[model samples]
Target chain A: SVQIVYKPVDLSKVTSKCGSLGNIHHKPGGGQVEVKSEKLDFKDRVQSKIGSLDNITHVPGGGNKKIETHKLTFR
Target chain B: SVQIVYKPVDLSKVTSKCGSLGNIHHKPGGGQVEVKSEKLDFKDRVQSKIGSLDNITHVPGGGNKKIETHKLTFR
Candidate 1:
């Protein structure tokens, strides 16, 4: 099996204005959301079997930026 | 077994200037480099077992930018 892990993006490393969204901004109450890592069994064309993650919302510095990266590991 | 797939970054989507590297630019005669997809067997702590990918380099429009993203699939 394999697991995918996501790390919070370092805001300082982000240089884009997010395309007229303006510079990265924080939300009120420090509330935010992020994607969770998933463990899956290997199979033929596993990528196709995996589904898409939806509603990935988060605050600017809340650690859930659009450019979030995921790495794979053995489980 | 599982496979990791890397997609060529869409240059138009990259807004960052790549730090002091200046705006994305192409190399001479379209000569550039990119990372290749790897297939690995599942195991415990697979991330560490995967080892590090060294020296990921490429030209701007050559489709080897640093913001490259990877997705997983079953093999």
Candidate 2:
């Protein structure tokens, strides 16, 4: 089972412009992962970066779980 | 009444090397107190300092409360 690594993001420096997309979740083991393409309506992608991982789990099989990336802005 | 006294320490400076020296508590009413001197074995005391106080209370009577000393470090 491949575990998702979570990195801590500093919220003090980053600026959140657009509204939040939503939360992303990782299962116990690892498997196939996919993100909802419908929610990809974001304007500025370069200014935004993944800050931290809220949680992680292992997927049962050997693929990837659905991953949701939220919209973020930088100051 | 006497209450436990708490002294604030600067955590950024103090390295908290020995984990925690446990916590000290003081009650209301005037009286003598004691700290387990056995846990006083600390190295490089110069780098250690007091940061901030967690809590404090006033005594009902007219005496002072027991004070807990917290170790802090410099960042």
Candidate 3:
């Protein structure tokens, strides 16, 4: 039951390349959330559509590809 | 830039179906991290392989498919 670690940020700084997320249901235990097709679609946090995780390809590990190779963990 | 929001947990209770992560590089602003093939692989928080984001397909929206939409928003 490993979960991907992530942090939250305000949507103001976020730009839309894909679209906005529909719904986000957090689970009771860990960081689990319900992922569905409708929950991930084109919507608007405002007039502008917020970006969805679907549009993301990589996490952005800076320019350097090597060096620190231990980030993710579990509990 | 938008990032998928996540929470952190300990590595003790986690079980591995995939593998452990290699490296993690955090960005200057927002909750952005570099995503690379090498940084995501099998190693170990211990003898168990930590799960990577690649293994995840959906976020887990509970059992219900509808209602409670418009959860994701921007600042």
Candidate 4:
């Protein structure tokens, strides 16, 4: 299996630099990915087989936000 | 197997409320997730193992964008 890595970023930087807002999605157990978009509607879907997580924090610093981490297991 | 967690949110909500745009991807069979970032290139890759989907929506109102949800299946 291939693994994708992503880091938390500052939202302002994306709009100022990219000329549009971007998208970032994370899986609860082991992976996280980001998607960039000039438009808002990102054409992707999250699966239901995986477990759900909450309490993800959005901090103030650009790419310096605190993320609440969680995990899900499928057996 | 490990399951992950995520939620469907307005693109604007992530930017204004969270101070950046976020990405949300769903699997055709099950599960959904979100990613947040300030950079255009999130630096993450979506895998080909899971199924693909389309018809996502982006509404106005600062995180109030409507998202068209889809699903993917893996056997």
Could you list the chain B TM-scores for each candidate? Answer: 0.15, 0.17, 0.15, 0.18
Tell me the tens digit of each residue's lDDT in model 3 across A1-75.
Answer: 323335433222111121222233222112322222222232323222212222222322121111112233332
Model 4, A21: alpha-carbon shift in Å? 1.1
Query: How does candidate 2 fare on TM-score?
Result: 0.12
Tens digits of per-residue lDDT for model 2 on B1-75? 222222332222111112112122332212222222222332322232122112232212112122223332222
Model 2 lDDT at residue A42: 30
True contacts kept of 4: 0.05
Predicted structure with the largest lDDT when compared to the true one: 4
- Candidate 1 C-alpha lDDT tens digits along A1-75: 543333433333322432222222222222222223345544433332111122122223112224445554343
Which TM-score does chain B of candidate 1 obtain? 0.15
Model 1's lDDT to the true fold? 0.30
Sliding window of 10 residues with minimal summed lDDT for model 3 chain B: B60-69
Cα-based TM-score, every candidate:
0.16, 0.12, 0.11, 0.17
* Top candidate (TM-score): 4
Model 4, residue A19: distance off in Å is: 3.1
Flag regions of model 1 displaced more than 4 Å.
A1-66, B1-7, B14-70, B73-75
Q: Is candidate 1 or candidate 3 better by lDDT?
A: 1
Off by over 4 Å in 3: A1-16, A30-75, B1-75
Q: What is the C-alpha RMSD of each candidate to the true structure, in Å?
A: 25.1, 32.9, 28.3, 25.0
lDDT of 3 at B7: 43
Model 4 lDDT per residue over B35-63, tens place: 43352322343332222333233322242
